[PDB]
Write an enzyme that holds these catalytic residues in place. Structure first.
Site, PDB file in Angstrom:
ATOM      1  CG  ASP A  14     -34.341   2.004   1.030  1.00  0.00           C
ATOM      2  OD1 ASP A  14     -34.751   1.768   2.166  1.00  0.00           O
ATOM      3  OD2 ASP A  14     -33.212   1.688   0.652  1.00  0.00           O
ATOM      4  CG  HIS A  16     -38.378   8.057  -0.237  1.00  0.00           C
ATOM      5  ND1 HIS A  16     -39.215   8.434   0.753  1.00  0.00           N
ATOM      6  CD2 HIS A  16     -37.701   9.196  -0.702  1.00  0.00           C
ATOM      7  CE1 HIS A  16     -39.051   9.762   0.885  1.00  0.00           C
ATOM      8  NE2 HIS A  16     -38.144  10.250   0.020  1.00  0.00           N
TER       9      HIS A  16
END
EC number: 5.4.99.1
Length: 137
Positions: A14, A16
């Site tokens: 992920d 992020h």
């Protein structure tokens, strides 16, 4: 009409607060119905988790865990499930190298779907790849 319905089990990525090559163009930057289900647990519980994760794709980005990964673990479930659209992909890993020879995983690759994408694969790893085996489902 609906988009794809893909998932990646165990622990993928992920970008992020990680920063990777996963949301380059597609994976979820496409708009698929993606779920990122956690670590390996009982395959009977992953079966229940398959009711929800009845995802035509389940790239279990396993970092070595479960019955010969989620290959013998969950693919055996996939076999005794129906292996409908459910393509079992693998990935993640750490110290690979011997992931472009094993005629065993590669056995279950051409024998099923169990392909594998670990760091070294394209910037859209088991993404355009889970899409390959989805287009070869």
């Amino acid at each position: 009409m609906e988009k794809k319905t893909i998932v990646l089990g165990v622990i993928g990525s992920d970008c992020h607060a990680v920063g990777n090559k996963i949301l380059d163009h597609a994976f979820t930057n496409a708009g698929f119905n993606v779920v990122n289900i956690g670590v390996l647990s009982p395959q009977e519980v992953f079966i229940k988790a398959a009711i929800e994760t009845k995802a035509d794709a389940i790239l279990l980005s396993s970092l070595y865990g479960q019955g010969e990964i989620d290959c013998k673990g969950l693919r055996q479930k996939c076999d005794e499930a129906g292996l409908e659209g459910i393509l079992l992909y693998v990935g993640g890993n750490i110290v690979v190298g011997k992931q472009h020879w094993p005629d065993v995983e590669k056995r279950f690759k051409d024998m099923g779907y169990d392909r594998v994408y670990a760091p070294g694969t394209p910037p859209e790893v088991g993404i355009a790849d889970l899409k390959k085996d989805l287009n070869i489902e």
